[PDB]
Paper text:
Pseudomonas aeruginosa can also secrete a mART toxin, known as exotoxin A (PE), but with an organization of its three functional domains (receptor, translocation, and enzymatic elements) that is opposite to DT. All these PLTs were composed of a single-chain amino acids that folded into three distinct structures: a receptor binding domain I, a translocation domain II, and a catalytic toxin domain III. Cytotoxicity associated with this family of toxins is due to their enzymatic activity and the ADP-ribosylation of eEF2. Our analysis of four of these new members by X-ray crystallography presents the defining three-domain structure typical of this family, despite substantial variability in the amino acid sequences of these proteins.
We performed a search of public databases using selected hallmarks present in the amino acid sequences of the three known PLTs to identify six additional family members and performed structural and functional assessments of all nine family members. These additional six PLTs were identified across a diverse spectrum of bacterial species: Chromobacterium haemolyticum, Janthinobacterium lividum, Collimonas fungivorans, Serratia fonticola, Acinetobacter baumannii, and Shewanella putrefaciens. Despite having disparate levels of sequence homology, all PLTs had nearly superimposable structures compared to PE with pairwise analysis showing root-mean-square deviation (RMSD) values ranging between 2.3 Å and 3.2 Å (all atoms). Primary sequence alignment of PLT proteins indicates that K57 is conserved in Spx but not in the others. In comparable conditions, Hmx and Jlx appeared to be more readily cleaved by human furin, with Ahx and Spx the slowest, and PE, Chx, Cfx, and Sfx being intermediate at pH 5.5. Variation in the level of cleavage despite strong conservation of the consensus furin-recognition motif and the similar accessibility to this site in all PLT structures suggest that other elements might be at play in mediating the furin-toxin interaction. We superposed the newly identified PLTs with PE and observed extremely high conservation and positioning of residues within the catalytic cleft, indicating that the NAD+ cofactor can be accommodated within this pocket. Remarkably, loops 1 and 2 of all PLTs superpose well with PE, whilst loop 3, which is conserved at the amino acid sequence level, presented more flexibility in our substrate-free structures and may regulate access of the catalytic site to diphthamide. Although we were not able to produce active toxins due to safety concerns, our structural analysis shows that elements involved in NAD+ binding and ADP transferase are conserved in all PLT family members, supporting their putative ADP-ribosylation activity. Only PLT genes in Aeromonas hydrophila, Chromobacterium haemolyticum, Collimonas fungivorans, and Shewanella putrefaciens matched the core gene GC content. Shewanella putrefaciens can infect fish and cause human respiratory and gastrointestinal infections.
Residue numbers in the entry: 1 to 156, 163 to 609
């Protein structure tokens, strides 16, 4: 009796909802107020739960069910095809919290909903956020949640609901489809929603980039009276935001790897509503994902990727699909499988329970790292996920111009003027030039558009990291394919410039000892104040005895470094040749002053 209520009328402002007579339900009917026909954008459903928000069962249709206690918010969600999926959030707050869900609208829009909990301080200001949970659901649920759904609430006695309603923001149609939804699977999602932009700024100390986060799109209420203005606690301190991404297809590791190799937004490799086939996906995205899948099907150790590639190129099994896939694009296979192997090793080391094989289908957790902070600590509840740290990369610093791409005939759309502008933007953001990195065309695409990240390397564990040099002639030797293809051919590659955040300048060390020399290991340990390997440090020294300098960035520093293209071309007439110092533009030499490296330990 009197089960029914009207959330968007009675609880728009405030309602004390009676739970004493058993279950309460409200139709959330959007059909009168919003026609999803010819709309592309985001529905943001929210309500604030006050006193009596503990010991409740909440539901949206039969699709999403939440259980609340004082210390936890637990939920189970339906998925498109993989069956139900359960998450437990340990509360960071003790007072009110908002239930938020995002429903993307449009035939071309993403095939995931977002769920997240914003916890307030004692005085009712937004202070803490849960992980952003991304669930790939059926086309039917995506459509229904944008039309009519029912909200159920039950105790086991009343609950204070306020600011119940729904808002909408249209996707910007001036940006092509890939770019348009690029931040759907990042913490910058919060920058799409007017009430949370400043929350993101205060918690991450990163910009809400106008051109990447829909700035200027009108965020408007459709029903009820939801929170639209910022009410962020002014005392909010920096903290890592986590975005947990479920892949219904079970191909998370392959999709993550394709994102990192190709520099393609992770959303583009997610579930599609209707079979898509973007030019960037058919050329790089799908083939790279497919190579990881074929490697998994071969049942080979991730420790052996470089020997599997070598074997495929020099002593292949004819008609073996993995060998043939490697042979088609060997250098892409090197970048692809050494990235996936590093991700699998990192996953394995996150928990005793974790196995290489659980990595294949694990959720991705995207971490919004705090600007400048040298360490980006993962939340405890991310230990069962594939971690990717969001740091600015080269693509954020290319500035205005046509699309930059890497070819044997040279870097496209990359003038001295564009480099000077990029350099100026980097030093204005406190980044410091540390040297040149030579890579393959595919290596450059990955590092610039995907970001620098750990790859497995055939070398001593203690000397692992990104190998660069202050001397562009050293880098130049690596600015080509790492090994020949199946016909014994090597392509020229790309010269890159590498910049570290200014926060790392005290950890840029130098020794007269030879890098990668077993006899230098204890002396380098003494210099950096702990045994190798390098963490958030770099070491500079002779490449070989008496030789030219090189620099190793520890992988944890390298992740935070930015690579942009050099205007030093690779000469395709003289593949394997020495750098002609006459091919170095004076405008580049002028911006290439190197740091004052630390030569004695701090203590
Ligand atoms: Mg915004």
């Amino acid at each position: 009796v009197n089960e029914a209520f009207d959330l968007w009328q009675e609880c728009a402002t405030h309602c004390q909802l009676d739970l004493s007579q058993g279950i309460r339900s409200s139709e959330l009917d959007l059909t009168p107020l919003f026609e999803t026909s010819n709309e592309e954008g985001i529905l943001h459903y929210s309500m604030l739960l006050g006193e009596g928000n503990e010991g409740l069962k909440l539901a949206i249709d039969n699709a999403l069910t939440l259980h609340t206690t004082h210390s936890t918010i637990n939920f189970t969600s339906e998925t498109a095809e993989s069956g139900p999926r359960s998450y437990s959030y340990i509360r960071k707050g003790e007072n009110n919290w908002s239930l938020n869900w995002l429903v993307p609208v449009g035939d071309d829009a993403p095939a995931s909903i977002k769920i997240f909990f914003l916890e307030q301080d004692a005085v009712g200001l937004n202070r803490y956020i849960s992980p952003i949970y991304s669930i790939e659901v059926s086309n039917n649920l995506l459509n229904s949640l944008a039309h009519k759904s029912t909200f159920y609430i039950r105790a086991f006695s009343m609950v204070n609901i306020s600011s119940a309603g729904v808002s909408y923001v249209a996707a910007p149609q001036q940006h092509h489809r890939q770019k348009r939804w690029s931040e759907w699977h990042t913490g910058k999602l919060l920058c799409f929603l007017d009430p949370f932009d400043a929350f993101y700024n205060y918690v991450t100390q990163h910009t809400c980039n106008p051109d990447d986060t829909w700035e200027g799109q009108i965020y408007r209420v459709l029903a009820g009276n939801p929170a639209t203005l910022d009410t962020t606690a002014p005392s909010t301190t920096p903290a890592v935001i986590s975005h947990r991404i479920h892949f219904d297809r079970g191909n998370s590791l392959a999709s993550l790897t394709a994102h990192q190799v190709c520099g393609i937004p992770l959303e583009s490799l997610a579930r599609t509503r209707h079979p898509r086939g973007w030019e960037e996906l058919n050329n790089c995205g799908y083939p790279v994902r497919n190579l990881v899948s074929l490697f998994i099907l071969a049942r080979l150790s991730w420790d052996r990727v470089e020997q599997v590639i070598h074997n495929a190129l020099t002593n292949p099994t004819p008609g073996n699909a993995l060998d043939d896939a490697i042979r088609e694009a060997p250098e892409r296979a090197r970048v692809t499988l050494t990235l996936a192997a590093a991700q699998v090793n990192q996953f394995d080391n996150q928990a005793a329970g974790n196995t290489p094989e659980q990595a294949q289908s694990a959720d991705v957790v995207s971490l919004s790292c705090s600007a400048g902070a040298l360490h980006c600590s993962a939340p405890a509840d991310s230990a069962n996920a594939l971690l990717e740290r969001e740091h600015p990369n080269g693509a954020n610093f290319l500035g205005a111009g046509e699309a930059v791409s890497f070819t044997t005939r040279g870097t496209r759309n990359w003038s001295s003027a564009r480099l000077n502008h990029a350099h100026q933007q980097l030093i204005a953001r406190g980044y410091v030039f540390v040297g040149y990195h030579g890579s393959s065309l595919e290596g450059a695409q990955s590092i610039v558009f995907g970001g620098i990240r750990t790859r497995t390397q055939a070398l001593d564990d203690v000397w692992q990291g990104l190998y660069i040099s202050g001397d562009p002639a050293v880098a130049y030797g690596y600015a080509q394919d790492q090994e020949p293809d199946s016909r014994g051919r090597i392509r020229n590659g790309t010269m890159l410039r590498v910049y570290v955040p200014g926060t790392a300048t005290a950890y840029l060390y130098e020794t007269p000892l030879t890098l990668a020399d077993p006899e230098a290991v204890d002396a380098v340990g003494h210099l950096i104040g702990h045994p190798l390997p390098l963490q958030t440090e770099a070491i500079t020294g002779p490449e070989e005895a008496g030789g030219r300098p090189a620099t190793i960035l520890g992988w944890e520093l390298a992740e935070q470094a930015v690579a942009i293209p050099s205007t030093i071309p690779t000469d395709p007439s003289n593949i394997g040749g020495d750098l002609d110092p006459s091919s170095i533009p004076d405008e580049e030499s002028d911006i290439s002053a190197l740091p004052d490296n630390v030569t004695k330990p701090h203590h």
